[PDB]
Amino acid sequence: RKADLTGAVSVVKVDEIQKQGENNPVKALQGRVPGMNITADGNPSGSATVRIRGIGTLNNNDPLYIIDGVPTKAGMHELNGNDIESIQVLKDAASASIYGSRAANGVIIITTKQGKKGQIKINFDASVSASMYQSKMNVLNTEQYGRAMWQAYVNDGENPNGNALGYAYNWGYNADGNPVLYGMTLSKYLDSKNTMPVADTDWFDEITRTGVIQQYNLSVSNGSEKGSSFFSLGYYKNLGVIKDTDFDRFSARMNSDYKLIDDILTIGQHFTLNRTSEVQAPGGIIETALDIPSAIPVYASDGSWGGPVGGWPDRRNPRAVLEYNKDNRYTYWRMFGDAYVNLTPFKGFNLRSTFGLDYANKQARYFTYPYQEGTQTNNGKSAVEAKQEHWTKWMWNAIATYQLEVGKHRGDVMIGMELNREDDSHFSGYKEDFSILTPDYMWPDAGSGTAQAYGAGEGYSLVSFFGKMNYSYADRYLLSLTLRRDGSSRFGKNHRYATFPSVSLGWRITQENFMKELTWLDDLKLRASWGQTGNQEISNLARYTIYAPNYGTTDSFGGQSYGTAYDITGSNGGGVLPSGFKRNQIGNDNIKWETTTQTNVGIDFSLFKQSLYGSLEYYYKKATDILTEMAGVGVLGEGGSRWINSGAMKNQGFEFNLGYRNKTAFGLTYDLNGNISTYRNEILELPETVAANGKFGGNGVKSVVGHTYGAQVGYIADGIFKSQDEVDNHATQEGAAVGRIRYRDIDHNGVIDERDQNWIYDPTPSFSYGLNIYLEYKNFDLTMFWQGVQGVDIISDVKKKSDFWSASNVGFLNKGTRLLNAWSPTNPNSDIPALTRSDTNNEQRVSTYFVENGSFLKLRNIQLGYTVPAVISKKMRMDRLRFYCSAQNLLTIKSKNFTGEDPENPNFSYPIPVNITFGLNIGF
Amino acid sequence: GKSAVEAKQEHWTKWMWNAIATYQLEVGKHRGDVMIGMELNREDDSHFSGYKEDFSILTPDYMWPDAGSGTAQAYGAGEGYSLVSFFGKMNYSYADRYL
Amino acid sequence: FSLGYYKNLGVIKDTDFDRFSARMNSDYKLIDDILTIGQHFTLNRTSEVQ
Amino acid sequence: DDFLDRQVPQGIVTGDQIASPEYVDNLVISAYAIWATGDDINSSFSLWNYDVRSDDCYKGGSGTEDGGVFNALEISKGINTTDWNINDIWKRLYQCITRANTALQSLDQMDEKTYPLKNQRIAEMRFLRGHAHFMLKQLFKKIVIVNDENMEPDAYNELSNTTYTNDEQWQKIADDFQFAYDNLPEVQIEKGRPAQAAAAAYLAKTYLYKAYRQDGADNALTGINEEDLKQVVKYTDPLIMAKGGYGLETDYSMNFLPQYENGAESVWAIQYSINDGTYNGNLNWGMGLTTPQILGCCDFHKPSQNLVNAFKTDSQGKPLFSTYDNENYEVATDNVDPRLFHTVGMPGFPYKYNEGYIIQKNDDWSRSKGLYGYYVSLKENVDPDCDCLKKGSYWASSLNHIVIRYADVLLMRAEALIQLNDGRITDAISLINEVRSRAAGSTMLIFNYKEDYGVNFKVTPYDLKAYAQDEAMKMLKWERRVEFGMESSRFFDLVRWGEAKDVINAYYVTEASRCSIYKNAGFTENKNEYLPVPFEQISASNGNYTQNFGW
Ligand SMILES: OC[C@H]1O[C@@](CO)(OC[C@H]2O[C@@](CO)(OC[C@H]3O[C@@](CO)(OC[C@H]4O[C@@](CO)(OC[C@H]5O[C@@](CO[C@]6(CO)O[C@H](CO)[C@@H](O)[C@@H]6O)(OC[C@H]6O[C@](O)(CO)[C@@H](O)[C@@H]6O)[C@@H](O)[C@@H]5O)[C@@H](O)[C@@H]4O)[C@@H](O)[C@@H]3O)[C@@H](O)[C@@H]2O)[C@@H](O)[C@@H]1O
């Protein structure tokens, strides 16, 4: 049962959602909804990025979740998703407009479990899972690193014995004169102090482990004619594959409703409390682990943490970083409550007053221990940072609804007034100069150094007046008209309020009398919708020219703190220096709402006695007057960024969902759910400065206007130079040599320069598809979900340090194993460029070499279960007893062009592990 | 001309677990209740505050630690305790007259 | 289910205390009165100038 | 309906309140703070990152890939207009200009009687804006002259770099210095605020740069203006400098030591402070990359062997004008100018006059494993035990960066007198002799080097006699080279003199033998002596910015 019946509505089967056993219900529906992209890195929390109907705006694209009628934008990883009864996604502007003013990026409706009338039930779910690392990046060992360094040295013509890294090479020349390596030897200690012995260390294995996930839920519901109630307690814990990273969550949900005065009066409430404690991996931990060479031992001779010495590259120990970061635990309390009252003066009139509250508390204590890893140290810096953050959102809604059933005409008229208020604040203290260096002793009162205080606050408000009219004729013709008047505190008084209309039409062809003989065609409906929605998801202080007294107490990297504090006297400090103000941004009083117009056409069909159902959708989204933050022209200096309505986004998309469920003669019930979606995005208008800096694409070389959002311009790599004759024949370029990347001459001017660039990267897949198979046979239920993406290109940063030697910010870094298969006179059948120590050809530039085919098809979740027969369960008095074993991310298929692994996450972010889970469900 | 802001945060967290086993008998005129119980209590308290000075506008909206331009101070402490209890209660009633 | 609001302005100027309160209590009896599961919860928000 | 108006911005000041008279002084401080907090490791206002193009120093780091754009700039090959460093320095200098313009706009709306020091603050703001404009002009020939504080932001889109010609742009830059000199006080109680003498000296520098005309589409010198030289001579008079109490220090190293900050020779410097209440102090984060490998990381701005050979002198105490670079300097057999040990830290010698740290040719001192040599600059570095050095993820100190030195004033006066060619050449010779005599007596910390490492110090002033114009010019050029080593002024001087191409090509040819980094190095006649206008700026301002010649 769709709650709109005339728009693009996707209904998610919650039974399959809980089968995957994911903490975040959103992450479970990664590819089960057409026109919906869910990206998850794989960290222990269920945090993920959601994109509905592609990218339709230049500001934040987070969709507006709605739970029990309360809107929000926070992630669902911090909420208990196991007590969800129904999930509805509103991807159409006309359908989602009536649910709030923040429906620009789509609306997701989440309904919590409620006690069913006339029965009382309980459900206890237990789940234990083991997560194993699968995308183990292959890196060179000590011998492989030495061989690669020797190959680079001999390719560059330098003496390999002058590496000054403890490597002694016994090598010679073959008959053809190509250098050949016979053997290598290493000094026992990398330094002259004999404190860092050489060893073969698997850093990826050292920093990874086998995580343990435990989930325990207990829900009870009780219904009655005078009311109903529901109480759920949930516990979740996930240990990440990366060491010293974990996330656990307690959840308590209480829902109830009461009917008084012979069903005239109703009072209901839905409340939930969550407590999530998490230790997160440090930024770029995978990058640090990959960069550090395997020759560095984990522990030194004296038992201290190992580190680079002498000429080894300046890379911190990933294991020591994880050990020091294990105490950076943050606690998050989530408060999601709602109380509603409903009154019915007569049969057709309803008045609902609803109050919703969302209170978020975050407390963190970050520690900075003194470390000395060889030549890497922080000069004995020890510090504590105690941070507190508060978020408070409250919403009040007044709804008046009238329904009439006169003749064959059904008419619903609803009006509503909504008020939203959000207030955010944060403050933190910083202390230094500790002695014991333990979490127990590291408190700000126990410090003896410089102390700093930080603190900020902000907020906004929303006012909405909405009206919805629905007309139904003969249960065959449906018309919907809605109007919205929305205002926000982020705009000036002149442009505070804006009006948004939406219209929807629907015709049930199967209800027409001219096809009564079509018994096979059970149902057929054609619907269209044209709607307008408003977007204002911008900075709260957007229309004000912001001047702030940035003294310079905030930590900055590279010294570009831009603080305002100068020793005008010239006493080299010693006190409070004079301060001032700096401009953060230039205000603009002409900013207004961003108008997104959505046109949707849908065909819903159901054939063979409601067995073969499906829907086909075509949508066109056009966003104009987009509030974009343009940067300064260059001479305007600091604070030149300002918000302006100079954007234009276009999205043309197709979606197709199909489902076929049927039994079998011998007792097998098979249900197949197929889904496919495609979309094309385009940028039509953009400010000149934004197109020049290339923040939305183009890399600052060409304007992204007229091209897909996120498209990147780069060079074209036409293979590599296999001979000097090839170098001479090709157009002249800087750094051209044998074994180097050959760049195509686009304009045929005879020289390779900055103008030989074209559009090479397009982050738009050809189509994303999903397939869910459910089989029931003799109390055995098997679930199998496949998700695939075809026609998508990906930029691989791992390739930059796996296909080249010394292609990073620093040299002598550890590289990938496939680097051993580089081009050489001995091995001419290779496409990887020859190893070198100097990047004369400048191979770090953006080109088609780093663009790979991201197409993949992976088994997201497979589950085999056994249900106890009813007679045994009744003998044990149990209503239901089930067991199941599942595998998540067990198998995947990638393209041959993709040289790396894990096409979903081809970057240095958190890896995606394989989960093996065993679970039980009891229905006492 | 001293202007300053002090932002203080305090947290208290107490959790208790109780396991109770009770048996009742009504034999003859003798009523007997025997109850045993195990209780665990844990309290953890913490607080931290930041102090900033040298403000100009001198209004609550402007008085924030990031907006200050003077000496800043940080204070912070934490403590806690735990309790373990094993208790037993026996009640005997004779003729509803002797307790 | 109970919802309460209280506000008191003191006789001394610029001193006040207000409090919002929300209490939810419930109990369920399952398996022919053998099993019982109950909960009592309350949330309070008091803002005060002393 | 006050629901949408109850909440107000928190912790910030609106644009209509920043013009109030009680904040203008604070804004003045802002215009100074950008010169100490608005510089990055890869973009410093000393312009040492872009000075690697000259023959004074190489680029440090692990290798060529460490700062690839800077390596391309050093080799003058493979330079693209879409370079992040060029746009970064452009944006930072225009941010400084914007702060100065905001301060000027706030100051211009004040009554003279209410604010007696209005003229002095306006002069200081104009001096800062002119300094930023001069640095942009040195970096880029075609720059936008933003000298209108009462200009709306939208009109900034109509600004163009071709509104004024080269001479007109130089005059516009010099007008601010003229106003500052006419308005700044003779003596400033606060060392941070520039004085009248500093404004006069910097105006003389601007007029000297204006004298070497670069008219025409190309970047070739088209003559020497006599009026500009006369203006330089007028504004470099010793009476003006003596009015402010500025003179040469008794020791050279006193100009680069924390114990003697804000000295007589420190005409104007950026005040860097420590323990000042910020996160790590207003340290010189632009020199963070220049710290040696003995501190753990960085090791950039490594002086070249060419400069060391230049510091070598003959038995007569004069620099070797033709045979200095034929052979490497020998500590035991070759006479050396004492200024070398105050500029370049050679291996086998104490680091920053510290006996406990001796520079060695190993991996503990060079991060490039000998690719970029083993020499370490000492002017911008400090003693590890100074207690003025702090670790804020980059080793930076509180040593002041002296923008204008009295030796620079004397050498500019000598240059003007020599190029005038109307007599008074003996005055320039006397100034050079005074500089050489100051160098000779700068041995208060390196006197034991004679009895500890066999170092022979032999420098003598030039004889007072008639000298030809070319001979005096060559002697002045050599004095400038041996005086401002590692001071980030060699490339600008070469560009101004018009002989940058030949000198850079000869340096590349000479150093290709001992350094492979210059194997493919090449300098274009009219392309590589000026940084190109960033492509992002040109794209943003369509039809307004014109790229430099040769790009
Ligand atoms: O190229 C990427 C993007 O950078 C852009 C942005 O527009 O411009 C460059 C941009 O970057 C800055 C940063 O302030 O300078 C970087 C620039 O500076 C160079 C010399 O020109 O190197 C200087 C020295 O820096 C060192 C430290 O001694 O390392 C810097 C190097 O390390 C980083 C992060 O690197 C990774 C990323 O995760 O983390 C580890 C450790 O480096 C590596 O595996 C990864 O490469 O930061 C250092 C980290 O150290 C920590 O302590 C660990 O937590 C943290 O404090 C930091 O996160 C980066 O800053 C940098 O990559 C040393 O290696 C060098 O000698 C040159 O190498 C480098 O390019 C800034 O000045 C400039 O504006 C664009 O070009 C582009 O889009």
Ligand SMILES: OC[C@H]1O[C@@](CO)(OC[C@H]2O[C@@](CO)(OC[C@H]3O[C@@](CO)(OC[C@H]4O[C@](O)(CO)[C@@H](O)[C@@H]4O)[C@@H](O)[C@@H]3O)[C@@H](O)[C@@H]2O)[C@@H](O)[C@@H]1O
């Ligand atoms: O700095 C970017 C980099 O660091 C993170 C934290 O690892 O962001 C830093 C700041 O992000 C904040 C601000 O909201 O929260 C993000 C983290 O806190 C969590 C706790 O549940 O989320 C809080 C709350 O805000 C969202 O993140 C945004 O709406 C919601 O997802 C969520 O409901 C947690 O999910 C985030 O890790 C703040 O806490 C940090 O100071 C990362 O976000 C980023 O990678």
Ligand SMILES: [Mg+2]
């Ligand atoms: Mg070309």
Ligand SMILES: [Mg+2]
């Ligand atoms: Mg100082």
